[PDB]
Amino acid sequence: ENHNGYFVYIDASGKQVTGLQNIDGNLQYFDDNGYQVKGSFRDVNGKHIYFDSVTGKASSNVDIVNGKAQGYDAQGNQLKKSYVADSSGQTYYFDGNGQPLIGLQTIDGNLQYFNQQGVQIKGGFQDVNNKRIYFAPNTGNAVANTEIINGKLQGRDANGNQVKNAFSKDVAGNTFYFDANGVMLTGLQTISGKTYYLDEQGHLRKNYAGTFNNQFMYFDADTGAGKTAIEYQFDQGLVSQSNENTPHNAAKSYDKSSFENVDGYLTADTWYRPTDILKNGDTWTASTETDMRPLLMTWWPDKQTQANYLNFMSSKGLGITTTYTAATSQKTLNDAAFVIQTAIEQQISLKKSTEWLRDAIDSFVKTQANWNKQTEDEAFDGLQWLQGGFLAYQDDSHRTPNTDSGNNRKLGRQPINIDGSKDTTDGKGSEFLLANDIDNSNPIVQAEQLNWLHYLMNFGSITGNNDNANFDGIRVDAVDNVDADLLKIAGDYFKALYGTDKSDANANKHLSILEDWNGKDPQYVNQQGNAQLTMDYTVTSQFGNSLTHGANNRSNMWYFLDTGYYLNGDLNKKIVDKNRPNSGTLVNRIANSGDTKVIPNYSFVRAHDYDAQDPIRKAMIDHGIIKNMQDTFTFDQLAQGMEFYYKDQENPSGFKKYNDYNLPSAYAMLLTNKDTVPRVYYGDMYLEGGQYMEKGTIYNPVISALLKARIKYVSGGQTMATDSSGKDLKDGETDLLTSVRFGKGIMTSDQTTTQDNSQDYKNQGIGVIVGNNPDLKLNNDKTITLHMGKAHKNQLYRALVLSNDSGIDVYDSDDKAPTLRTNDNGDLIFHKTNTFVKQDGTIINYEMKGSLNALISGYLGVWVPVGASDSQDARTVATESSSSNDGSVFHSNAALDSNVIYEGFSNFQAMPTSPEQSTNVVIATKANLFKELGITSFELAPQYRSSGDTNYGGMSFLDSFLNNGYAFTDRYDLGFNKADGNPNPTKYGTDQDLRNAIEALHKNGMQAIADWVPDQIYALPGKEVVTATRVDERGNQLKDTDFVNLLYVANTKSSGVDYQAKYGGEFLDKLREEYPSLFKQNQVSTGQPIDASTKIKQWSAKYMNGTNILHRGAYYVLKDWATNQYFNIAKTNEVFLPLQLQNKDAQTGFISDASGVKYYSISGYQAKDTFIEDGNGNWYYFDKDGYMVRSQQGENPIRTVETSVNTRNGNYYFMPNGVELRKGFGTDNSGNVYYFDDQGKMVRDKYINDDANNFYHLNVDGTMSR
Amino acid sequence: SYVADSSGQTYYFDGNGQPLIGLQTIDGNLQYFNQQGVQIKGGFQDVNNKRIYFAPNTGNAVANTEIINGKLQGRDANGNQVKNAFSKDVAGNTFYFDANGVMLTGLQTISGKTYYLDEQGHLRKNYAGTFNNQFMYFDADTGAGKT
Ligand SMILES: OC[C@H]1O[C@H](OC[C@H]2O[C@H](O[C@@H]3[C@@H](O)[C@@H](OC[C@H]4O[C@H](O[C@@H]5[C@@H](O)[C@@H](OC[C@H]6O[C@H](O)[C@H](O)[C@@H](O)[C@@H]6O)O[C@H](CO)[C@H]5O)[C@H](O)[C@@H](O)[C@@H]4O)O[C@H](CO)[C@H]3O)[C@H](O)[C@@H](O)[C@@H]2O)[C@H](O)[C@@H](O)[C@@H]1O
Ligand SMILES: OC[C@H]1O[C@H](O[C@@H]2[C@@H](O)[C@@H](OC[C@H]3O[C@H](O)[C@H](O)[C@@H](O)[C@@H]3O)O[C@H](CO)[C@H]2O)[C@H](O)[C@@H](O)[C@@H]1O
């Protein structure tokens, strides 16, 4: 609290705090009056403690104590032998006695200067002694620097002496040379028999190629010394590898028998069958089919990998421990590989096992960048945040034909982009979300999704011959991440089977909702005839801004009205604005009399996936239970975190760190709004963790009352107003929102009676008053009014719910509540101070007062008419007549509004401790309870068997390890028993438990909603080889990635023996016979109808768009660098292997001939049309003819390269010895300078910066303007 | 231990001799390391949702301000944007940022105390001026106006 400009702290006790206090982990102080101290020193006990100027938090400073400076730490101890920075960012060093050092000093091996007051000189020169020394900006350490004396640059070394006949730096990082006279040199200079190039400024240029002595000259990256680049830098001549061991280690066979493989290809951890085995390191013996050995014992992709293998295996006791490099001779490495092979066979005999080796190879393989995620470009922006990035599979019939999709895989066909017309913009859908993304643009897959849909809508019929245990409707998960055809497919299915387009009674018997977050989805859904209900994020959003989020600065309640709906916000005139910038809330409620058609919708305050998952994890992070949001956690870890979350939720202080504010007030509005189907979140009713329905939340009573009141009173028209005109509040204004419903046939304030002369209205209707300001106090004059309407003149009303300083009181019946009577015009008038009387006769006192406690931060009052019958029902039944010929399914009206959906699960529930406490068992016993709260549809969690802790590569997701059912391997397994007969429940119970749960809900007149999850599937056990490109969520290639059309081992193939195999495609034939039009109707995104001619009993890559990155590497599938062809052994007519393995002679190295230089890879093949790196790290390009590209005298060294590997296409600068220039400037034959990047490519049309803070500009044609 | 290489770049090697990567706390200091294990110094960095500035020589996490669109914004040491509060920049200037995140200017009364911010938005301390038409000295400690 703030009093007279000062912070005071008032305890949980209610006591004002003085003295030193650690409050919530921060050390602070308050003087005798209780005010807090900031930017000052205080003395407590033996400590001299400074407190910060912003926060008032204890930290280090320097005080002038008496006449002298003395340093202090956070705890208030005098510091000795240390450095302290003071309030103004100045630095002292205090010695062994606590006294600050002055003058020149050597501290921790560093030279530093201190002024006469003990302050450290930083970022300037300083005349200590005869010499002048520069001291660095942040360290303050002595360093070489240059300054301008007269008009000429001069150099100063670290000792403060001027530099003569030598090179010296400046702080920025530029090197200069200064001659005998001290003067900086320029241009081309030969000193100590070596030649350096200094630019016009005098900067020494390193890694710079230029024609300097009329003959090319490359200036060293190390020292800038000019070499002629005539000497070849490759150190490996052409050598033969074959020897006495070659025929023994060669493969027994060139096929799947002798080679571990995937779709014919080989992998880094492949093992093969050699012809013979050096058993025990003694005697070569023919191999038996079980004698498999690792390919890396005998072959390597390149010398670097070979050297790394030798060093790694050496470290494990297998030979002389070695430092080998790619520069080591090939002959040496091969000899060393054999002594390791010997040692290996000895440890195989000694251990009588090869498992130890499997683990050694696996370990070694993950060490190498090409075989781990370092070549996968892990990224976390956008949806990549979930799992680290995506790979899009490609159609490549030449290399990977099993994986070809038949020209499907249209990505990002979300509703707004169903036809691809926004593919080039951000309007393209984020097709990739999680795990293996199913290709819902493929007609065959579309048919399979319909089969699954049929299976769910007839679950009970099919699995228990129980026609009462069937789901009634669906929730469509992740609409914006799949092909929008699925909506039409689902819509048309329900039309065909249930005649949902015939009547509101048919439609409303199968309530179906969409998870459709895009702000333009509502209008799409409505153009397509509302086959499923859109969400209304606009109201959920406004709850966030005005009530639910944040302790203080909240949007005004005014924003709920959306007055812009009317021209000039003319609430007097009420002219609807026919043309607006596509904005505002979906349904206006200022004066909604049901006269204008509106888009039917569901709405909510929270969800299993909204305002839950993030807070619950932030809480775990905040208490050090995990480090990252993507971090894997155990259920025990979750339970501990949950305890902090609950503690925060129920905090009597009223402050909430992770949880949402004002949930009751939010539900009061959600549950009284016209033209919406409200949805209630299990986790606002019961605690989100632990056991299902284990313990109610503090909000439960209030929400329960609102729910029951909704059945009795909520009908008719609506109005909504605020004591507020905009962002800013005038003097009297409270910003208190007043929402009213009138009764069954009453549509307006001024309507006094129904047209049909029904009397139902008189005891119906409701009044809601809500505020978002806990510190709200009314002026004494101020009156606040609820216009209950002219159909309710002089009527007695009683409170349902009233907020106060300790909680919110809930009144169950007319007798126990305060009454108040409306006037002749039908208004309930409220003042700052009120005296209400019970109908009994008792008098009650009540202030219109903002309150702050666990249940509210603001005001909440709800009022209902007294005299309500016990069985009073204000709901409207849906009519069987064909009311509309518009073609649409759902219509927003009184009937639809009479529904309430309950989202009845939480992602963070604990696993059942016993079968009796399984969610679906509990639902069956408690069905009664939900009927009486007015739930007409029960949204059950997804019932599919969780993929669990299974993880074939890449990052696991919480859906999977929390077993919530959104992550599954088998789409048709909803809790079936193991094949041995044992029970095998999901998190929610067996399949019988589910059928019982569904039946129980029908016995209590409620529907059951199936969560339809078509976007992805997790943890498929079978491997295939795909052609993959690294992409972002929309399937766009990452800008700077080498990972393009590469072969990759993915987990895409289903077991083939699961419930997907049993029930896959089975119901389609029966359906085509009975409803032919479903199978003949064309879909929009494809132009085709769904295709039931092919059944999906087993998933595989051809039906997938892609996957999250699996951490295997860009080149885990083995390839020859020289030809760029991948090794394969599937068909004996098209085998490609390294020549060693076929007992042929593999020659490897560089060899010159009259025409030029050639290169042979470790596998014995000639490099053509490919880049090659030598053992010293230099790069070369070999042209289509097989010859190294090299610059000639008088010719342009810049060459344009078009390779088989497209990503490398570009302009390169090859020197006379063929070395590609990288990360440096290169001069062409005509004097123009270009720059070439990390990978050798020319850079165009941008500014480029230097480590020394030099800037250069490169024109569009590549040249450097600088 | 820390080691700086030939080019003046810095790594930290752990108990096994392997360099640390990503966000780390060392000697009680928060620091970031790129995918190659190199230490980020003198720049912003999007680690998680938050954006954090790391100091030029220490590389330690600190509050800083950057210009987003055409308006100065404030970033704290944890990488969260600053709203309704004072925040520094690396140079040493203090600013105040309102509920909307926007830096304030001129004479401002917040939490019943009065501060003077110049045209650039710098909080002025140890500054004497006739501000409310009556003399006012702005504190050397916190910049709060006394009479
Ligand atoms: O223009 C001067 C008037 O400004 C205020 O009036 C705002 C309007 O209020 C009523 O309609 C609103 C309707 O706009 C919408 O508001 C949602 C949301 O708005 C604010 O949050 C925004 C946030 O969405 C985001 O905006 C980004 C930009 O989006 C578009 O490009 C906009 O055109 C642009 O202006 C936005 O900047 O980020 C913004 C910055 O952080 C943020 O401002 C507001 O803070 C939230 O509380 C609010 O939920 O839906 C509301 C219902 O939910 C409607 O009530 C009026 O009908 C409309 O005419 C107004 O223009 C101000 O109050 C008026 O007094 C000014 O005259
Ligand atoms: O931090 C505890 C440690 O501090 C001293 O060690 C310093 C070390 O911190 C470093 O100083 C560089 C630089 O850092 C601060 O920002 C300071 O303001 C600035 O003046 C300082 O120059 O480098 C030196 C070199 O070894 C170290 O000595 C203490 O000496 C040590 O005993 C403390 O434990």
Q: DSSP of A622-658, one letter per residue?
A: HTTS-SSTT----HHHHHHHHHHHHHHHT-TT---SS
Based on the number of CB atoms within 10 Å of its own CB, is B115 exposed (0-12), middle (13-18) or buried (19 or more)? buried
Note the Cα A1112 to chain centre separation in Å: 21
Experimental method: X-ray
Contact A506, A498 (CB under 8 A): yes
CB of A54 less than 8 A from some CB of B = yes
Give the count of beta carbons closer than 10 Å to the beta carbon of residue A1031.
23
Give the residue among A706, A702, A773, A739 at the shortest CA–CA distance from A546. Answer: A773
The verdict on whether residue A609 carries a ligand-binding annotation is no
CB of B62 less than 8 A from some CB of A = no
Helix (H) or strand (E) holding A455: helix A443-457
Contact A1210, A1242 (CB under 8 A): yes
Which residues lie across from A226 on neighbouring strands? A219
Per-residue HEC secondary structure of A338-398 comes to HHHHHHHHHHHHHHCCCHHHHHHHHHHHHHCHHHCHHHCCCCCCHHHHCCCCEEEECCCCC
Give the count of beta carbons closer than 10 Å to the beta carbon of residue A419.
13
Give the count of beta carbons closer than 10 Å to the beta carbon of residue A390.
29
Contact A201, A209 (CB under 8 A): no
Task: Give the pair of three-digit tokens for residue A660.
Answer: 């949402």
CB of B17 less than 8 A from some CB of A = no
Measured distance between the N- and C-terminal CA atoms of chain B, rounded to whole angstroms: 53
- Which of A5, A136, A1251 has its CB closest to that of B112? A5
Give the residue among A1240, A1222, A1207, A1111 at the shortest CA–CA distance from A377. Answer: A1111
Question: For residue A538, which atom of ligand 1 is closest to its CA?
Answer: 53
* CA B95 to ligand 1 centroid distance, Å: 27
Mutating which of B10, B141, B146, B147 best tests the A interface, going by the most A Cβ atoms within 10 A? B141
Q: How far is B136 from chain A (nearest CA, A)?
A: 15
Residues after which chain A has a gap (C–N > 2.5 Å): none
Give the residue among B72, B111, B112, B78 at the shortest CA–CA distance from B95. Answer: B72
B103 DSSP assignment: B
Query: Rounded to an integer, what distance in angstroms lies between the CA atom of residue A266 and that of residue A1117?
Result: 6
Query: Rounded to an integer, what distance in angstroms lies between the CA atom of residue A109 and that of residue A142?
Result: 11
Instruction: Sort out which chain A residues have CB atoms less than 8 A from B144's CB and list them.
Output: 5
Contact A189, A198 (CB under 8 A): yes
Contact B95, B82 (CB under 8 A): no
Based on the number of CB atoms within 10 Å of its own CB, is A426 exposed (0-12), middle (13-18) or buried (19 or more)? exposed
Query: Rounded to an integer, what distance in angstroms lies between the CA atom of residue A657 and that of residue A518?
Result: 28
Q: Ligand 2: which of A77, A108, A138 to mutate, judged by most atoms within 8 Å of the beta carbon?
A: A108
CB of A38 less than 8 A from some CB of B = yes
CB of A4 less than 8 A from some CB of B = yes
* CA A555 to ligand 1 centroid distance, Å: 10
A562 lines ligand 1 (CB under 6 A): yes
Alpha helices in A1075-1164 (DSSP H): 1076-1080
CB of A139 less than 8 A from some CB of B = yes
A444 DSSP assignment: H
b/e code A625-648 from CB counts within 10 Å (16+ = b): bbeebbeebeeeebebbbebbbeb
Query: Rounded to an integer, what distance in angstroms lies between the CA atom of residue A302 and that of residue A512?
Result: 58
Q: How far is B141 from chain A (nearest CA, A)?
A: 5
Q: If you measure CA to CA, which chain A residue comes closest to B95?
A: A54
A585 lines ligand 1 (CB under 6 A): yes
Alpha helices in A458-509 (DSSP H): 459-464, 485-498, 504-508
Contact map slice: A 351-380 vs B, CB within 8 A:
374, 378
Contact A886, A962 (CB under 8 A): no
Place of tokens 């600190």: B62
A427 lines ligand 1 (CB under 6 A): no
| Contact assignment for B99 to A38 by CB distance below 8 Å | no
Q: Evaluate the CA torsion angle B113, B118, B121, B127 in order and state its sign.
A: negative
H helices then E strands: how many in chain B?
A: 0, 16
Place of tokens 């518009």: A886
Based on the number of CB atoms within 10 Å of its own CB, is A612 exposed (0-12), middle (13-18) or buried (19 or more)? buried
Give the residue among A314, A331, A262, A258 at the shortest CA–CA distance from A288. Answer: A258
Instruction: Sort out which chain A residues have CB atoms less than 8 A from B56's CB and list them.
Output: 137-138
Query: Rounded to an integer, what distance in angstroms lies between the CA atom of residue A374 and that of residue A402?
Result: 28
Nearest Cα residue to atom 50 of ligand 1: A584
Strands A473-476 and A1007-1012, how do they pair?
A: parallel
Alpha helices in A859-918 (DSSP H): 894-897
Instruction: Write down how long chain B is.
Output: 147
Task: Give the pair of three-digit tokens for residue A1060.
Answer: 């997907």
A538 lines ligand 1 (CB under 6 A): yes
A353 lines ligand 2 (CB under 6 A): no
In the chain, the amino acid numbered A795 is: Q
Per-residue HEC secondary structure of B21-77 comes to CCCEEECCEEECECCCCCECCCEEECCCCCCEEECCCCCCEECEEEEECCEEEEECC
Query: Rounded to an integer, what distance in angstroms lies between the CA atom of residue A1121 and that of residue A1140?
Result: 16
Question: For residue A140, which atom of ligand 2 is closest to its CA?
Answer: 22
Place of tokens 């344009």: A1200
* CA B79 to ligand 1 centroid distance, Å: 27
Angle among Cα A402, A406, A409 to the nearest 5 degrees reads: 100
Task: Give the pair of three-digit tokens for residue A749.
Answer: 């304030």
Helix (H) or strand (E) holding A334: helix A330-351
A259 DSSP assignment: B
Helix (H) or strand (E) holding A332: helix A330-351
Query: Rounded to an integer, what distance in angstroms lies between the CA atom of residue A92 and that of residue A70?
Result: 9
Task: Say which residues have a Cβ less than 8 Å from residue A557's Cβ, sequence separation at least 6.
Answer: A546, A722, A724, A735, A736, A737, A770, A771, A772
Based on the number of CB atoms within 10 Å of its own CB, is A32 exposed (0-12), middle (13-18) or buried (19 or more)? exposed
Query: Rounded to an integer, what distance in angstroms lies between the CA atom of residue A714 and that of residue A53?
Result: 55
CB of A628 less than 8 A from some CB of B = yes
Instruction: Sort out which chain A residues have CB atoms less than 8 A from B113's CB and list them.
Output: 5
Q: Ligand 2: which of A59, A62, A77, A83 to mutate, judged by most atoms within 8 Å of the beta carbon?
A: A83
Which residues lie across from A72 on neighbouring strands? A61, A78
Task: Give the pair of three-digit tokens for residue A437.
Answer: 């993304």
CATH of the domain at A750: 3.20.20.470
Query: Rounded to an integer, what distance in angstroms lies between the CA atom of residue A1209 and that of residue A1205?
Result: 7
In the chain, the amino acid numbered A1129 is: I
DSSP codes, A695-761: SB-TTHHHHHHHHHHHHHH--S-EEEEES--SSS--TT----EEEEE--TT--SSS--S-SS---GG
B80 lines ligand 2 (CB under 6 A): no
Task: Give the pair of three-digit tokens for residue A1109.
Answer: 């990155």
- Which of A5, A374, A1251 has its CB closest to that of B111? A5
Query: Rounded to an integer, what distance in angstroms lies between the CA atom of residue B24 and that of residue B47?
Result: 11
Note the Cα A1210 to chain centre separation in Å: 34
Query: Rounded to an integer, what distance in angstroms lies between the CA atom of residue A841 and that of residue A369?
Result: 83
Give the count of beta carbons closer than 10 Å to the beta carbon of residue A43.
10
Task: Give the pair of three-digit tokens for residue A758.
Answer: 């029904």
Task: Say which residues have a Cβ less than 8 Å from residue B6's Cβ, sequence separation at least 6.
Answer: none
Query: Rounded to an integer, what distance in angstroms lies between the CA atom of residue A1253 and that of residue A170?
Result: 11
Task: Give the pair of three-digit tokens for residue A561.
Answer: 């009205």
Q: Ligand 1: which of A562, A728, A735, A737 to mutate, judged by most atoms within 8 Å of the beta carbon?
A: A562
Taking the CA of B102 as reference, the closest ligand is 1
A555 lines ligand 1 (CB under 6 A): yes
B94 DSSP assignment: E
A108 lines ligand 2 (CB under 6 A): yes
Per-residue HEC secondary structure of A1216-1249 comes to CCCCECCCEEEECCCCCEEEECCCCCECCCEEEE
Query: Rounded to an integer, what distance in angstroms lies between the CA atom of residue A128 and that of residue A731?
Result: 67
Measured distance between the N- and C-terminal CA atoms of chain A, rounded to whole angstroms: 58
The verdict on whether residue A899 carries a ligand-binding annotation is no
Contact A155, A165 (CB under 8 A): no
Query: Rounded to an integer, what distance in angstroms lies between the CA atom of residue A136 and that of residue A117?
Result: 19
Instruction: Sort out which chain B residues have CB atoms less than 8 A from A628's CB and list them.
Output: 48
A227 DSSP assignment: E
Taking the CA of B81 as reference, the closest ligand is 1
Task: Say which residues have a Cβ less than 8 Å from residue A870's Cβ, sequence separation at least 6.
Answer: none
* CA A1208 to ligand 2 centroid distance, Å: 46
- Which of A4, A374, A629 has its CB closest to that of B112? A4
* CA A60 to ligand 2 centroid distance, Å: 14
A727 lines ligand 1 (CB under 6 A): yes
H helices then E strands: how many in chain A?
A: 22, 68
Contact A395, A409 (CB under 8 A): yes
Structural domain range at position A792: 538-898
CB of A1 less than 8 A from some CB of B = no
Taking the CA of A95 as reference, the closest ligand is 2
Query: Rounded to an integer, what distance in angstroms lies between the CA atom of residue A1217 and that of residue A1215?
Result: 5
Resolution in A for the shown PDB structure? 3.2
Taking the CA of A544 as reference, the closest ligand is 1
Per-residue HEC secondary structure of A525-565 comes to HHHCCCCCEEECHHHHHHHHHHHHCCCCCCCCHHHHCCHHH
3-class SS at A685?
helix
| Contact assignment for B85 to A54 by CB distance below 8 Å | yes
Sort residue A858 into left (φ over 0), alpha (ψ -120 to 50) or beta. left
Q: How far is A630 from chain B (nearest CA, A)?
A: 10
Q: Evaluate the CA torsion angle A116, A120, A126, A127 in order and state its sign.
A: positive
Give the count of beta carbons closer than 10 Å to the beta carbon of residue A762.
17
Task: Give the pair of three-digit tokens for residue A863.
Answer: 């009022």
| Contact assignment for A629 to B92 by CB distance below 8 Å | no
